[PDB]
Coordinates of C-alpha atoms and ligand atoms in Angstrom, one line a residue:
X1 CA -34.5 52.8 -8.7
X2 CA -33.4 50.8 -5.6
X3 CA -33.3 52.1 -2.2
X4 CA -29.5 53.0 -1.1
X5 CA -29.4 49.9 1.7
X6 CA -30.2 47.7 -1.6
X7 CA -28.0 49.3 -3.3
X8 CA -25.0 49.4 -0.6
X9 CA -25.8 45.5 0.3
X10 CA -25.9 44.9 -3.8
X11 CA -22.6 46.3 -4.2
X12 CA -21.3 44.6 -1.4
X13 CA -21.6 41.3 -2.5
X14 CA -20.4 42.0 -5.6
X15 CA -17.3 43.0 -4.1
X16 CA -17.5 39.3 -2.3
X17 CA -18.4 37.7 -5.5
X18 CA -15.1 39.3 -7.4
X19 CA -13.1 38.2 -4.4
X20 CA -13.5 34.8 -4.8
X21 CA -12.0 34.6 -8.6
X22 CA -8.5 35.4 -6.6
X23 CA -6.6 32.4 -6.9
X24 CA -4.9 33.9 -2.8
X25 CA -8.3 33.6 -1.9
X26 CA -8.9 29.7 -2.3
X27 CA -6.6 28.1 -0.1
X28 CA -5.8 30.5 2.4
X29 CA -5.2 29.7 6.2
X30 CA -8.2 30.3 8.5
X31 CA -8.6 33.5 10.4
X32 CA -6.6 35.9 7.7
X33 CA -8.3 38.7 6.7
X34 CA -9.5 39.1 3.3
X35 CA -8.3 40.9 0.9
X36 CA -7.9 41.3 -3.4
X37 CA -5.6 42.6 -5.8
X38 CA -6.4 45.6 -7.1
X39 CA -10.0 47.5 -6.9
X40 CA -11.8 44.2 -6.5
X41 CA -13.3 44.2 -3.0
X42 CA -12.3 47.9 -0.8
X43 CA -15.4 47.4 0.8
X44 CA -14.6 43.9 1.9
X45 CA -10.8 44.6 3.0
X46 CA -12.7 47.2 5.3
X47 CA -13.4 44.6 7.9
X48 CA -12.4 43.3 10.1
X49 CA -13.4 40.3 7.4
X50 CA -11.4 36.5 7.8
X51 CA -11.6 32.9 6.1
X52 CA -13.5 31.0 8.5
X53 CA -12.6 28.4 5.3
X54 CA -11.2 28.5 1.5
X55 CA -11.6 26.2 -0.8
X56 CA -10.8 24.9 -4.4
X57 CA -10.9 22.4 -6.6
X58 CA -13.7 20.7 -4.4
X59 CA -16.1 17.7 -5.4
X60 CA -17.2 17.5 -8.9
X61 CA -16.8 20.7 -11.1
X62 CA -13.9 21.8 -9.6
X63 CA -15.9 24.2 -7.1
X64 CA -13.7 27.3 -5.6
X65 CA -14.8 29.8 -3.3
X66 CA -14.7 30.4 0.6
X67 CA -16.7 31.0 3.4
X68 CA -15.6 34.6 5.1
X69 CA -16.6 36.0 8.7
X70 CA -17.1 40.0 8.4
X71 CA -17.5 41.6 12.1
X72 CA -18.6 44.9 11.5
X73 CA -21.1 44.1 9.1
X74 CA -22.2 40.7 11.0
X75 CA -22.6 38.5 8.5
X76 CA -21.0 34.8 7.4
X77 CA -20.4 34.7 3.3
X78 CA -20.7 31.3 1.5
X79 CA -18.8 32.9 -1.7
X80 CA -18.7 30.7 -5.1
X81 CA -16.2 31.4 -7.8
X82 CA -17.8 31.7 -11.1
X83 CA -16.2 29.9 -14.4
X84 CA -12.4 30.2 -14.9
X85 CA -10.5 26.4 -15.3
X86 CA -11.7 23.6 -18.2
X87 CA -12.9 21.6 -15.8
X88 CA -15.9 24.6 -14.5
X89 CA -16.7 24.9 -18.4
X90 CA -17.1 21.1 -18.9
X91 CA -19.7 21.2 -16.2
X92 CA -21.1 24.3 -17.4
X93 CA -22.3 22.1 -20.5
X94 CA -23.8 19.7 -18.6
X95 CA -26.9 21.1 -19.4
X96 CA -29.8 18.6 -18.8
X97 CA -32.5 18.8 -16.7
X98 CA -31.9 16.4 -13.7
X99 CA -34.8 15.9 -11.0
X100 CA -34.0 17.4 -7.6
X101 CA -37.4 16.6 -6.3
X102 CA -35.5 16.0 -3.0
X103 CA -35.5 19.9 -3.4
X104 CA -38.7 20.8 -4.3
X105 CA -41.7 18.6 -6.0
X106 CA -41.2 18.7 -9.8
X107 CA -38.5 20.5 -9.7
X108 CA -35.5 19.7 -12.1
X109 CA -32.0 21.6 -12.1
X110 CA -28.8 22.1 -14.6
X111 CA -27.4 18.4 -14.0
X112 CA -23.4 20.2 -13.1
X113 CA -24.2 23.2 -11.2
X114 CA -26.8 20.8 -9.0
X115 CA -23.8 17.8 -9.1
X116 CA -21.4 20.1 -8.1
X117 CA -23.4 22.0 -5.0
X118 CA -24.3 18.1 -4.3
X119 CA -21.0 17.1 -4.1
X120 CA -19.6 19.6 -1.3
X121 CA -23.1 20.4 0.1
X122 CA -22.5 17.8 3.4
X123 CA -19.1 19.9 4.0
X124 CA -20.5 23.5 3.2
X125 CA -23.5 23.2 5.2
X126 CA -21.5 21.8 8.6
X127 CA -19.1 25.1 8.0
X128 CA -22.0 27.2 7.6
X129 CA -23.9 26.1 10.9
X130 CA -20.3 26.1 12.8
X131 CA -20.3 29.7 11.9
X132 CA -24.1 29.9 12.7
X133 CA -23.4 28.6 16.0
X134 CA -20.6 30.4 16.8
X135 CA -21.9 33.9 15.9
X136 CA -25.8 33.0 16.4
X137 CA -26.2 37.4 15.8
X138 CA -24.5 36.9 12.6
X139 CA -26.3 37.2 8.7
X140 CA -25.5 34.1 6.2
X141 CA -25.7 35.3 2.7
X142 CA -24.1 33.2 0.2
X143 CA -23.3 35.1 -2.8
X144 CA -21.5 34.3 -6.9
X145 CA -20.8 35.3 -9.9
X146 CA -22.4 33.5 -13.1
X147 CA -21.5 29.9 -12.2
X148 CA -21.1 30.7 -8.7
X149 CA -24.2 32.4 -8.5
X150 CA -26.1 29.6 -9.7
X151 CA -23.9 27.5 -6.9
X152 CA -25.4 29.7 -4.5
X153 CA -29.0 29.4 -5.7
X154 CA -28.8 26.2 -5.5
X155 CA -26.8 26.2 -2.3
X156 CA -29.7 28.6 -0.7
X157 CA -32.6 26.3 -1.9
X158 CA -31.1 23.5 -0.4
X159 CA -29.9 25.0 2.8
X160 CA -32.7 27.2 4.0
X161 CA -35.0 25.8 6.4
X162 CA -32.9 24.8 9.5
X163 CA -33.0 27.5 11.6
X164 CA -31.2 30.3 9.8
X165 CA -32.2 32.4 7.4
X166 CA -30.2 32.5 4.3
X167 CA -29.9 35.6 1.7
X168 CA -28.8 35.1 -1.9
X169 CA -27.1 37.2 -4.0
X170 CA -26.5 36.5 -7.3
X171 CA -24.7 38.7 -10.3
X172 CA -25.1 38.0 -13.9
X173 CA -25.9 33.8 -13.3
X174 CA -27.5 31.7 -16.0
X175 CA -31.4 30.0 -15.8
X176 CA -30.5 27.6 -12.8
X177 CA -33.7 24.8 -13.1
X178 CA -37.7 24.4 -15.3
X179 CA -40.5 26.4 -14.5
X180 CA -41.3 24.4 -11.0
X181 CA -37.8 25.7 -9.8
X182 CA -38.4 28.8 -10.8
X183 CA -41.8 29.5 -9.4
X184 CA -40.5 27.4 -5.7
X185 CA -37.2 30.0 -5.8
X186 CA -40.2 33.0 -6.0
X187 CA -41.6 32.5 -3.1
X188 CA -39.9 30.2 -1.2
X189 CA -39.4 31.4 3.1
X190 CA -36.3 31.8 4.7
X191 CA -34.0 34.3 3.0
X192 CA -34.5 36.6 0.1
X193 CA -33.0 35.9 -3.3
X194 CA -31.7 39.2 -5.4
X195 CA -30.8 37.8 -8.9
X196 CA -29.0 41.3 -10.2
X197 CA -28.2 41.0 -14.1
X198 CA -26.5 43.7 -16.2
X199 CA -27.8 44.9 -19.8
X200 CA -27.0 42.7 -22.4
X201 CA -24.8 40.4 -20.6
X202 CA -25.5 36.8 -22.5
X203 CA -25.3 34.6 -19.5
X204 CA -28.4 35.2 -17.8
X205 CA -30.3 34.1 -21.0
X206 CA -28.7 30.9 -20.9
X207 CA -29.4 28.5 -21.2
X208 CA -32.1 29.1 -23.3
X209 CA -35.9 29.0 -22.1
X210 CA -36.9 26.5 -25.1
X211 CA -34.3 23.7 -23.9
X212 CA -36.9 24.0 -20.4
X213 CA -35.0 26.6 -18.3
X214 CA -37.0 29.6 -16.3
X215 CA -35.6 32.5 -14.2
X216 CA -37.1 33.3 -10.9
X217 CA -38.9 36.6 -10.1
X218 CA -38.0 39.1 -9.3
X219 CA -35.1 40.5 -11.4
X220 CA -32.6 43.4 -10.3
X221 CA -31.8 45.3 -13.8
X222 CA -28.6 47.1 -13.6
X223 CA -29.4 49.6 -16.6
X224 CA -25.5 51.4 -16.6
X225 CA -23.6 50.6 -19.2
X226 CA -19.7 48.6 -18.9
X227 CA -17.4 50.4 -16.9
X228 CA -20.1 53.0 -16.1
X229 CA -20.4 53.1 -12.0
X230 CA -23.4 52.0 -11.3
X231 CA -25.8 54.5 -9.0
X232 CA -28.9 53.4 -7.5
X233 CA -30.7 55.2 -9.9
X234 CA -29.6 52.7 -12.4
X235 CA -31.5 49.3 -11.5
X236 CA -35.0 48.3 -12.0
X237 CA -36.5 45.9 -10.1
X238 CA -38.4 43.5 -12.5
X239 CA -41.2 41.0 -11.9
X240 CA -43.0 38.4 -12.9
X241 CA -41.3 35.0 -14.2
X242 CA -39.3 34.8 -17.2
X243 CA -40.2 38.4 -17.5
X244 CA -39.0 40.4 -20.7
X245 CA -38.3 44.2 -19.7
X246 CA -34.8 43.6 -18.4
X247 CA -31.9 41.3 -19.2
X248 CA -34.1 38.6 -20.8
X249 CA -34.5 41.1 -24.0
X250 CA -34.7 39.9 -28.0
X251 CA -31.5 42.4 -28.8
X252 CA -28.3 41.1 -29.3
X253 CA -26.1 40.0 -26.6
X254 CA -22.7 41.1 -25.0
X255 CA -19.8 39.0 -23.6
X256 CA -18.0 42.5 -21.8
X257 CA -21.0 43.6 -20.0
X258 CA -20.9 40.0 -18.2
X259 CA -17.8 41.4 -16.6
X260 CA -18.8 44.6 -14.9
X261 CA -21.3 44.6 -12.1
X262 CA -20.5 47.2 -10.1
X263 CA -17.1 47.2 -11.1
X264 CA -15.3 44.5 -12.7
X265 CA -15.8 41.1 -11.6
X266 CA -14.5 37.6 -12.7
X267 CA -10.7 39.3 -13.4
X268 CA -8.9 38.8 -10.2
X269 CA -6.0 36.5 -10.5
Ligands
OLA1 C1 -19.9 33.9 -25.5 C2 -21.1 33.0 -25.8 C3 -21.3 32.0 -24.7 C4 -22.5 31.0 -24.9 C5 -22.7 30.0 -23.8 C6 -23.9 29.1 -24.1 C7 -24.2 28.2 -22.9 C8 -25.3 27.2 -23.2 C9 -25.8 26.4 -22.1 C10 -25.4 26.5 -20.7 C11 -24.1 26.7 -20.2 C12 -24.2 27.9 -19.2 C13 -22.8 28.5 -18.9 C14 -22.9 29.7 -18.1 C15 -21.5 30.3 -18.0 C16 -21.4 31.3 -16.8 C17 -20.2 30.8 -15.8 C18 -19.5 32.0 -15.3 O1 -19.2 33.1 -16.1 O2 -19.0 32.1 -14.0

């Protein structure tokens, strides 16, 4: 059980997270308003929401997303598309452990997903403090699915720190770094981090905790099953790192159930 703001902010930015996957929603002209095809985002296409900036195809592991400005709910979105083209998954398999102690001391990250936010970081982060400066009132939350909610991990640990505070939101996204980056990511100031997972989805057990990866506490546990609407009744929050009594389970995994937080997500064309 999850308190209905939680709840309401957690399907929110799923909604924000699905958008991005919508091919319209990657290079569209600044100051449209947002929408998706189909039952994607309603909640988004209630605002009052625009593209302060789209993107794809950017830097190295062909990063896609876009930066939106909602007015009623005051907030500025960093949004990360999750996999989709050949050359995401190529990066996905970079899977080494790469120092980021420019990060945080001992910390090492997945060598792509900390490549790629490395590669676009100097143009994201001027965007995001535009915005900031702009609409000072405003919220920045950066938000993904899988891929892109590593990208906005990693985004968020980088970025916090400079005068704004920065809330993550992340759906169904694999280990992101070793056991120093999980721990730093556990407490670190500035923003809160809500790493949501959905029951036997296989992507947030990868990759695996014996090649050196760690998750962050604490864990949202969306208990629902695929295609089941999810009611706040349905997620546990979970503690402790690397701990076992939600996603990270010893039962066999499930590809579907990667694509159905909230509603479905990682479809939009
Ligand atoms: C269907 C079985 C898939 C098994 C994948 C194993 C991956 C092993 C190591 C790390 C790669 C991580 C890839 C994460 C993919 C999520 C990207 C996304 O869905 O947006």
């Amino acid at each position: 059980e999850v308190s209905q703001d939680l709840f309401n902010q957690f399907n929110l930015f799923a909604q924000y997270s699905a958008a991005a996957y919508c091919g319209k929603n990657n290079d569209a002209p600044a100051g449209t308003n947002i929408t998706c095809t189909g039952n994607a985002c309603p909640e988004v296409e209630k605002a009052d929401a625009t593209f302060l900036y789209s993107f794809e195809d950017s830097g190295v592991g062909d990063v896609t997303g876009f930066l939106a400005l909602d007015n009623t709910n005051k907030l500025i979105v960093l949004s990360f598309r999750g996999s989709r083209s050949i050359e995401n998954w190529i990066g996905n398999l970079n899977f080494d452990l790469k120092e980021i102690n420019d990060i945080c001391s001992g910390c090492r990250g997945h060598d792509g997903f900390t490549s790629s936010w490395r590669s676009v970081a100097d143009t994201l982060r001027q965007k995001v403090e535009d915005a900031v400066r702009e609409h000072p009132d405003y919220r920045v939350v950066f938000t993904g699915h899988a891929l892109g909610g590593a990208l906005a991990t990693v985004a968020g640990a980088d970025l916090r720190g400079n005068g704004y505070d920065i809330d993550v939101f992340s759906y169904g996204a694999p280990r992101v770094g070793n056991r120093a980056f999980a721990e730093f990511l556990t407490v670190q100031t500035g923003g809160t981090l809500y790493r949501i997972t959905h029951t036997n989805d296989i992507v947030p057990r990868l990759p695996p905790r014996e090649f050196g990866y760690s998750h962050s506490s604490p864990e949202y546990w969306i208990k629902s099953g695929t295609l089941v609407p999810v009611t706040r009744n349905d997620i546990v929050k979970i503690e402790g790192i690397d701990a076992t009594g939600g996603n990270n389970q010893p039962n066999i995994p499930d590809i579907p159930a990667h694509l159905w937080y909230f509603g479905l997500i990682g479809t939009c064309l």
